Amino acid sequence: SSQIRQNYSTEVEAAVNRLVNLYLRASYTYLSLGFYFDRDDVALEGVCHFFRELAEEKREGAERLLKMQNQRGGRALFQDLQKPSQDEWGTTLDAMKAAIVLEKSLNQALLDLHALGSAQADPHLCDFLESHFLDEEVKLIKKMGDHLTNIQRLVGSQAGLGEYLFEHCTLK
Amino acid sequence: SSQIRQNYSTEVEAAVNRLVNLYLRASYTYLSLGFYFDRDDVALEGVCHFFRELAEEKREGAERLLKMQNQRGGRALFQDLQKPSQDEWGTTLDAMKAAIVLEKSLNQALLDLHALGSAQADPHLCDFLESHFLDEEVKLIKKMGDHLTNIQRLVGSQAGLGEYLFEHCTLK
Amino acid sequence: SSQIRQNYSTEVEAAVNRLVNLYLRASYTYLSLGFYFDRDDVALEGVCHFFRELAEEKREGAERLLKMQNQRGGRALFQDLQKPSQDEWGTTLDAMKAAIVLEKSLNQALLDLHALGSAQADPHLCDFLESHFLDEEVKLIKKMGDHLTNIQRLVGSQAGLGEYLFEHCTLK
Amino acid sequence: SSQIRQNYSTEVEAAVNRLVNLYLRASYTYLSLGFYFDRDDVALEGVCHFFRELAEEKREGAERLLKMQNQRGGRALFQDLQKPSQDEWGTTLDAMKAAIVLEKSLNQALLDLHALGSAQADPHLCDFLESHFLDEEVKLIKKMGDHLTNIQRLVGSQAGLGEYLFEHCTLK
Amino acid sequence: SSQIRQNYSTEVEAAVNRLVNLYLRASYTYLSLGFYFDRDDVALEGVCHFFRELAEEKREGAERLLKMQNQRGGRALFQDLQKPSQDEWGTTLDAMKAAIVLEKSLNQALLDLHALGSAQADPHLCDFLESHFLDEEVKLIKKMGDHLTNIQRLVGSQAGLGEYLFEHCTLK
Amino acid sequence: SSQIRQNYSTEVEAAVNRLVNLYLRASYTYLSLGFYFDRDDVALEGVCHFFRELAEEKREGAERLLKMQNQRGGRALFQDLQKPSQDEWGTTLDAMKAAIVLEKSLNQALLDLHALGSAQADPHLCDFLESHFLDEEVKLIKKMGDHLTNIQRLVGSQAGLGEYLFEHCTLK
Ligand SMILES: [Au+]
Ligand SMILES: [Au+]
Ligand SMILES: [Au+]
Ligand SMILES: [Au+]
Ligand SMILES: [Au+]
Ligand SMILES: [Au+]
Ligand SMILES: [Au+]
Ligand SMILES: [Au+]
Ligand SMILES: [Au+]
Ligand SMILES: [Au+]
Ligand SMILES: [Au+]
Ligand SMILES: [Au+]
C-alpha cells in the first residue's frame, strides 16, 4: 500500500518490470556482440565499440525505467537474464542485421506499453516513453538501416565500393 | 586454433568465463540492492548510491576479465544471469551483511582462479588478478567491515550513538 | 671534552636523554592507539587520525630534544623503547582517558627538567622548554579535557546528546 | 663476491644475460624489417615506422634487463648479435607473420625465466618480469594478431575489403 | 573472530607483527645514526640527512605493514623496541657498512615472509611485498653498494680521489 | 635494377653496409662500457652516462647511413654484430683510452669511404659524410683528448689535482 502511488495500474507496473528485463537482455546481447568483434580473429575495433556503446545505452534505458518505477510507487522485480541468442556473431552484416531485429523488438515492446498506458489513461507513462524512448529507438533504427545499406553496398560490388568511397573521400 | 594463444590453459579460459558470470551476477545483485533503497518507503539515498556504485564496479570487473580473455586468445562465453537472491533487502544492516557475503564469495573465486593459474604456471593470469582484483576486494571488504561495525554501533545503544557522533562531529 | 659545550650540566644532559625516551615511548603508545581504532571491529577513523597525529607530534618533540642535545654539545644516548601499556584500548573514552594520563606524565617530566635547569642556572634550557614544549602541553591537555567532557556528555544522556547537537548543528 | 648480491642465483644471472641477447637480436631483426619497408621498391612508410618503433622497444627491454642485472649484483656479459634470419622480408603479411613468431619466442623465453625464478624462490625477478614484460608481450601479440587478421581480410576478397572500409570509414 | 578475515593465516599475521618490529627497530637505528653525524665533533650534515631520511622510510614501511595487517583482519601487536647496536657509529664508511648489513637483514626478512605467504597460498600478501617492499630494498641496497664503493675510492688513494673528482666535476 | 639509383657505385653501396656494421659495433661497445660503470663495485654514474650517450649517438649514425643507403637506391645488408673486445673495462682512464681508439677507427673508416666516393666521383656521398659525420668525429675526438688529459692530471699528482680544482672551482 504505497503512500505515493496514484493512477499507476498493476498492469503497467508489471509490464515496466518486463521491459526492464528486455532492456537488460539487450544490453547483455550487445556486450556479447562487442566482445566478439574484439577477438583477434575478428578484430573490427569500430564494430566492437559500436556494440559496446549500445550495451551501455540499453543498460541506461533499464535504469531509467527502474527509476520511473520507483517514482510512481511501483516495485522493481528482477528476473533471470537469459544469455544472448548466439555465442559467435558472424560478419559485420550478420551482426548489424541481428541488432536491427533486436531494436525492432524493443521498439514494439515500447509501443505495446504505450498502448497499455493509453488504455489505462496513464498520461505520465505515455509522456515518459515518448520523451525518453520512442524517438531514441526511431533514430537508432534509422542509423542501423543506413548502416545495413552501406555494409551491403561495400561488400557487394565495384560500383558499390566506388559510390561509398566518393561519398566518404570527396564529399567529406 | 588461435594465432595469439600462448601458455593459456583451457581450464583457466573456462574459469575466467565462470568468473565473468559471477561478477555480472554481483552487478545485478547490487542493481537490485540500489533500487530497493530508492523506494519511497525505504528512502535511504546514500545507501542506494553506495550499492549502485558497486553495481558499476562489478560490471567493470567483468569487462576487464572479458578484455583479458580476448588478450590471451580465449573465447568469451556467456551464460544465463541468475536473478538476485532476494527481491527486498531489509535494513541497511541486512543489506551490508548480504554485500559482505557476496564480496567474500567473489574474493574466494578470485583466490581459487589464482591457485589455478599458479598450478598451470600462468604468471600473466596471476599478475592480472593481483594487480586488478585482489587488493580491490581486500580494500572493499575492509570498508564493509568498518560499515557493519558503525551500523551496529548506531542502531545498538546510547553509548554507541554517542561514540559515533563524537567521531563524526568533533574529530571531523 | 666538547669544543662547544658551555653551561650544560651532565645532569641536564642525562635528563634530556631520558625525556627523549619518554617522548618516543609516547609516540609508540599513540601509534598503537591509532591502529587500534583502524581495526574493522572498532572503525572510528577520526579517533585513529587524532592518535596517529599525536604519534607524529611526540616523535617531533623527541627530535627537537635530540637536536638541542647536539646544539649544546651533549651526547644523545638511546635506550630500549618499552611497548605500550595496553594491546587493546577500549572505548574512545578509555583511550582519551589514557591519553590525558600520558600527557600529564610528559608535562610533569617537562616541569621537572625545567626545575632542574633552573637549579643549574641554565637559562637556554629553560627558554627552550618554555618556548617549544610547555604551552604545547597545556594547549593539548586543555583540548583533551574538552574532549573527555564531550565524550561523557554524548555517551551519558538524552539531555547531554541534545546539548552537544545544538552546539554542533545550530551554533555552528 | 658482490657486496649487494642477495638471493640471486647464478642460473638467473646467466639466463638474464641470454635474454638480453635475445632482445637485442629482436631489436636488430626489427631494424632490418624497418629499413626493408623504407626501400623505394617497397615503400610502405607506416610498416617501416611500425617496425622501427618495435626495434626501439626491444632495445629498451634489453637495457631494462641490464639495469636489473646490475641492481641485483649480477654481471652483464654480452655475446655476438646474430644477423636477422632474412635480408628481404616479403609482403606486409610475411613480415607481420615473422614478427609474431619473434614475439612468441621472446614471450616463451620470458615465461621460461619466470619459471626459473619461481623455482629459485626469487620473487623480485618474478615481479620484475610480470610488471615490465609479461603484459607488454601479451598486449603486443594481441595487436599483431589483430593486424594479421586485417591484413588477410584486405588482401583476400571484395567482402573483406568492404568490411574493413566500413569499420574504418563509417564506424570511425 | 574477524568479520573480514579471509585466507589470512595466523602464521602470516604473527610474522607481519615481527616484521613491523624489525622495521621500527631499523628506523630507531637510523635515528641514532642521523644524530651521531649531527654531533659538532662529527659534523657531516649530508650523512646525517641520508640517515634521518632512512629513519622516516623505515617508519613508513612499518605503518604500511600495520595498515595491511588491519586490512586483512589481523591484529597489530607491538613489542619492546630494542635500542640500536651502537651508541657511536665511527666513520661514514663504518656507518654505511652497518646500514647495508641492516638493509640485507630487512630484505631477508621480507624474502622469508614472501616464502611463507607463498607456502600459505596467500597471493595478496605476496603481491603486497613485491609491490611495496622488495624492489625498494633492491634499489636501496644497490645505492648503498654504490656509496661504499665511492667512499672506499675517496678515502683510499690519489688515483681514487682523482677518478671520483673527474666523474663529479667534469662528467657532471 | 633500381628505379632511383643514379651515380651510386656498388663499391660505395658495400662500404656503406660495412660502415653501418662498424657503427652498430661501436654502439654495442659503448652499451657494454656504460653498464660496466653502473656496476655497484665500479659506480661512476657520470662515466656510465657518458658512454651510454655515445652508444645512442653511434646507433643514430648507423640509422642515418641506412636511411642514406635507401635514399640512393642501395640495399641495406646486415651482418653478425661482434661482441665488444672486453667484458670489463678497467679504470675511467682505461675506458676513455679504449673509446678514443674506437673513435679513431670510425674516423679512419669515414675518411676511407670519403676517398672512395671521391674516386667514384660521388659528390652526394662526399657531402653526406662531411656534413653529418666528419666534424662530429673531430669534435668528439677533441673532447676525448681533453678528457684523457684531465683524467691523467687528476690521477697523477698533487700539482695536477690542484690545477684541475682551481680551473673547476675558481675559474668556473
Ligand atoms: Au495517455
Ligand atoms: Au499517448
Ligand atoms: Au604464477
Ligand atoms: Au602468483
Ligand atoms: Au633558567
Ligand atoms: Au625559568
Ligand atoms: Au617468485
Ligand atoms: Au611468480
Ligand atoms: Au602467492
Ligand atoms: Au609470489
Ligand atoms: Au666528391
Ligand atoms: Au670531397
Swiss-Prot record, chains A, B, C, D, E, F:
PTM annotation (N-acetylserine): residues: S1
Metal-binding found in the keyword field: yes
Keywords on record: Acetylation, Cytoplasm, Cytoplasmic vesicle, Iron, Iron storage, Lysosome, Metal-binding
Gene Ontology annotations for the cellular component aspect, listed alphabetically: autolysosome; autophagosome; cytoplasm; cytoplasmic vesicle; ferritin complex
GO molecular function, one term: ferric iron binding
InterPro entries: Ferritin, Ferritin-like, Ferritin-like_diiron, Ferritin-like_SF, Ferritin_CS, Ferritin_DPS_dom
Record-linked PROSITE patterns: FERRITIN_1, FERRITIN_2, FERRITIN_LIKE
GO terms for biological process, alphabetical: intracellular iron ion homeostasis; iron ion transport
Family annotation (SUPFAM superfamilies): Ferritin-like
Subcellular location: Cytoplasmic vesicle, Autophagosome; Cytoplasm; Autolysosome
Span of domain Ferritin-like diiron: 6-155
Superkingdom in the source lineage: Eukaryota
Other comment: In horse spleen the light chain is the major chain.
Function: Stores iron in a soluble, non-toxic, readily available form. Important for iron homeostasis. Iron is taken up in the ferrous form and deposited as ferric hydroxides after oxidation. Also plays a role in delivery of iron to cells. Mediates iron uptake in capsule cells of the developing kidney. Delivery to lysosomes by the cargo receptor NCOA4 for autophagic degradation and release or iron.
Subunit structure: Oligomer of 24 subunits. There are two types of subunits: L (light) chain and H (heavy) chain. The major chain can be light or heavy, depending on the species and tissue type. The functional molecule forms a roughly spherical shell with a diameter of 12 nm and contains a central cavity into which the insoluble mineral iron core is deposited. Interacts with NCOA4.
Family label: Belongs to the ferritin family.
Protein name, per record: Ferritin light chain
Upper lineage: Eukaryota, Metazoa, Chordata, Craniata, Vertebrata
Gene behind the chain: FTL
